[PDB]
Amino acid sequence: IPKFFHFISERWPQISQLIDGSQIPEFDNLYLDMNSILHNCTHGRLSEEEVYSKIFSYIDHLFHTIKPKQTFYMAIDGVAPRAKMNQQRARRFRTAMDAEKALQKAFDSNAITPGTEFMAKLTENLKYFIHDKITNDTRWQNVKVIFSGHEVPGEGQHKIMDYIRAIRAQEDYNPNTRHCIYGLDADLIILGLSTHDHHFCLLREEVTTLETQNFFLLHLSILREYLALEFEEITDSVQFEYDFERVLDDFIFVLFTIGNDFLPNLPDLHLKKGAFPVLLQTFKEALQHMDGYINEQGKINLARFSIWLKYLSDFEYLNFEKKDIDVEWFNQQLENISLEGERKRTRMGKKLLMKQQKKLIGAVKPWLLKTVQRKVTSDADFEIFPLEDKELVRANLDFLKEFAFDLGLILAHSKSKDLYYFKLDLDSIXXXXXXXXXXXXXXXXXXXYSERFVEWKDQYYKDKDTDSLKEMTENYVGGLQWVLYYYYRGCPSWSWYYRYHYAPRISDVIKGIDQNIEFHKGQPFKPFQQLMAVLPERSKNLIPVVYDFYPNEVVVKISFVDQKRLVEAMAPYDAKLSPDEKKRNSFGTDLIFIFNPQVDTVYKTPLAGLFNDIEHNHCIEREFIPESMENVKFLFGLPKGAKLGASSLAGFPSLKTLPLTAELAYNSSVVFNFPSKQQSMVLHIQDLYSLSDLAKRHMGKIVYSRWPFLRESKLLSLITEETVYEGVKSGKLTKVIERKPQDFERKEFRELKMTLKSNYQRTKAILLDDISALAKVVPVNGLVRNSDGSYSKSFNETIEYYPLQLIVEDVKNKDERYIEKEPLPINKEFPKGSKVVFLGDYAYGGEATVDGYNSETRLKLTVKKGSLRAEPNIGKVRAKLDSQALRFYPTQXXXXXXXXXXXXXXXKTVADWLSEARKPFVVVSLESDSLTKASMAAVESEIIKYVSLPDSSEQKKLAKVPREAILNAESSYVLLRSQRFHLGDRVMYIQDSGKVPLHSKGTVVGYTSIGKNVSIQVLFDNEIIAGNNFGGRLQTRRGLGLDSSFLLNLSDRQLVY
């Protein structure tokens, strides 16, 4: 849907988190919607090795970003239902055209379709990679890997949905399963929402090399929390039981009604112009004038939906009777609509009042006229008229009392106020047949589209007064229903489709609701038939060469295939296929891949270049995956005992942790590049209320900063205008010192508070009180081993400041990866057979095996020295060459700078001359440099020859080794990160998982610190299937940026002996 991400992002400004090497949550399941990857990896012809090198690198990259713990699910599109073949076929035709049209005059992407020759190879390759991965990557060894390849019918997107639905449906489903779906499509956000699983993210890539690309977690937990805020505003007004999850479901129907892949878009919605607030507003008002929800678990209530339609119809109509449409116009439409709903609801209320008012006089009349039929003499000699809705009596006392006054009555009650009634005002009195006339008079008193429009709409249909419009219409309405069922319940039909290229006018969809809609499940095309129903006589050569409906000319008004005509026109040629084509023209099953150490088989590569066979270290099997359905219903909405809000698993955000107040407003929020012109959910934060015992309680303790995304951070001081509260480790107990601020502190504090409050307004639509104190904190960046074998919380050296009001003291669910642990005995901490990294001079970085223990403090190992040849030399040499070749000076700035300031002055010149000079950009963070492009290459050439000199390995039984000559690279990210690296330094990949084979050496060609996290750019000795040429700077895939935590530095040996 056209601005959907953009609009959602600005309106609800905290939904998505940049992945930047800081800790992200843990996930149980990762699902890949892979089709975009294949496309993206087969453009920028390049070779099969290069192509699959990219794809494996991508899947593998995403796999390591999340680190799923239970299930990793990969999906490729199989054969789609017919609802999609027209667009499949439109797309496909446009690709062969544009290829011929462009490129050719002024690889066939269309191969990526099921049944194709390319795709049979793809599955063969992909299997190999999964097998290579499960064998060698330890991370890939404790998850179910499930492959649903193109051999199985259905969209990846949909096949994923059908898995999630099948597992959540069980009666042992983990209620708080953490889900993550990768994919470019903004729709996944909606399917995501459709699942009603609170703990759910989307892995996305930016929308303004692989290791330098930006990815995001879009967090459905905070999105929901925002959505709740969006719709709570009612609760009190709707005429049924308010339920957020049901509101959400209707909001989802609305979103599909606005855009989805199958039906074509309703005309003139005006999204890229600001209608979105309005459309939404439409739904908000509609939900208040209905008897229940539009969406019964994906079944649509047409009667209800038409109440919504009416608003959509007025929308269409009002906007036709406008000139241009811009934001200015939709902002004032938004207002009018809100004001109408208010007025409408106030009248509804007046009407309800009058009705009550009439029943009341209507019931009083008879009893009053009988009562006044008796002339007074000389109280219990009359009937009392009880009133029963005390709550409604109470809201109406001036009226009741005036009514009582007028009719000659008292409104009485009881001491306990549990009973109200009327009674004759007897204590207030002959031809008083004028009382009976006064009574009767008082009783009497209370008893008191356009036509240019139609034509303009007619001139639309003609262009692309009947009952074949009832037919279009009903096709569309049927569509909506097919779309919802598709998403909430499963494909309801392999054969249904929308038979038109265009949508009806909004104010006509009405004509289409007068139907009763069912579907017939059907069955999917065989691959080859789908191959024919899609694909032009311009990429004919992907179809088994053996085979109108196929223009060379064609909003793509491509004709709709006649299915019946087709299955038949092919069946002649049916019996003539190979055995491979009869293979390709059938269906597969999902496959499941397991790790098994007692498997030891040879796996032959279907690939050249850098790939080889998976040897005596091959350890996977494939199998058919089942599912195990039964007499099981789907579960719709949250599972029983699902944690939400402040009780969410660690890592997932929540707004519920602070106390606050939310309000839609025009906050000019700046989530992207320019300030939004629409309302945001502005968050007004409430201060929590001493400040001295606060410091005393939390100083040097464990606090939670970064509100939204609560995180473990130690409290360092508590700045204030006039007082600093500091923490000093007294040894055991850290204590609080209170003092006046130094001038720069008092400067910073004023400059900081002003900067925070406005960044929180501008960037996140958080309106802060106004800054009382300021917690200064450092966040937990892992665990770290002490001398005594225990492990404790490590902290990032970089100071962060947070207003105190955003500081949370504690949280139900604490991040397990940061539970501090007690010491362990040798045999448990380095179990016999465990593989470890040898420190110590014999093989710094050698593969070690724990054989036994010599004491309970010393152990014995086998150390493989991987190489008996000196480390190569060039990196170091060239690092000194560059530094001697490019000298720096203090102001009182590089020799190249001197030559630019000498060129500019000698020309007196300007200005563009200067913009012209600025072309070769050397723009990067402060601690981060590089080898000169020349040096890079020199290092490459010198390596290529080094890595081909004869060389051998060597093992050695070792004994009496103390525990600190060995480490577990697994669980030493922090130590490893604590190492200096310099240009030229020799290095080794030390981790048992990731994109480099264990123990590979390389040379540091340049470092890159994104503030706190350092990324080392390694030129590797061997080529790396996961590498790149650092953008042409190299001639082979020897290059990789990587996190220090992956690397043992061999030149500047900082963990030896």
Q: Which residue has the tokens 């015992």?
A: 693
Q: How far apart are CA 536 and CA 850, in angstroms?
A: 62
CB 702 within 8 A of CB 767: no
449 CB neighbour count, 10 Å cutoff:
13
CB 1037 within 8 A of CB 1023: yes
**Torsion sign across C-alpha atoms 252, 254, 255, 257:** positive
Cα(first)–Cα(last) distance of the chain, in Å? 60
147 CB neighbour count, 10 Å cutoff:
25
Residue 723 backbone zone (phi > 0: left; psi -120 to 50: alpha; other: beta): beta
Residue 180 backbone zone (phi > 0: left; psi -120 to 50: alpha; other: beta): beta
Q: How far apart are CA 62 and CA 475, in angstroms?
A: 40
CB 43 within 8 A of CB 1036: no
Residue 288 backbone zone (phi > 0: left; psi -120 to 50: alpha; other: beta): alpha
Tokens at 543, concatenated: 């179809």
Tokens at 680, concatenated: 């945001």
Name the residue among 311, 297, 217 with its Cα closest to residue 258: 311
β-pair partners for 791? 785, 821
CA atoms within 13 A on the CB side of 358: 6
Query: Residue 644 to residues 174, 224, 661, 791, 813: CA-CA distances in angstroms?
Result: 14, 10, 19, 31, 11
CB 986 within 8 A of CB 871: yes
Q: How far apart are CA 175 and CA 179, in angstroms?
A: 11
Tokens at 686, concatenated: 């409430």
**With 0-12 CB in 10 A as exposed, 13-18 as middle and 19+ as buried, what is 103?**
exposed
Q: How far apart are CA 1032 and CA 1029, in angstroms?
A: 5
Reduce the DSSP state of residue 1007 to 3 states and report it.
Answer: strand
Q: How far apart are CA 115 and CA 95, in angstroms?
A: 18
CA 991 to chain centre: 29
288 CB neighbour count, 10 Å cutoff:
16
Q: Which residue has the tokens 């303790």?
A: 701
Q: Which long-range contacts (CB under 8 A, 24 or more apart) does 298-306 make?
A: 298/484, 298/485, 298/487, 298/488, 298/489, 299/484, 299/485, 300/253, 300/480, 300/481, 300/484, 302/477, 302/513, 305/253, 305/513, 306/510, 306/513
Q: How far apart are CA 119 and CA 536, in angstroms?
A: 18
Phi, psi of 967 (to 5 degrees): -140, 155
Q: How far apart are CA 829 and CA 832, in angstroms?
A: 10
CA atoms within 13 A on the CB side of 346: 6
Phi, psi of 582 (to 5 degrees): -65, -30
- The DSSP symbol for 626 reads -
Tokens at 20, concatenated: 């930047």
770 assigned ligand-binding residue: no
CB 25 within 8 A of CB 219: no
Give one DSSP letter per residue of 159-171, joined into a string.
HHHHHHHHHHTSS
β-pair partners for 767? 684
326 assigned ligand-binding residue: no
The binding site consists of 185, 187, 261
The binding site for Mn(2+) consists of 185, 187, 261
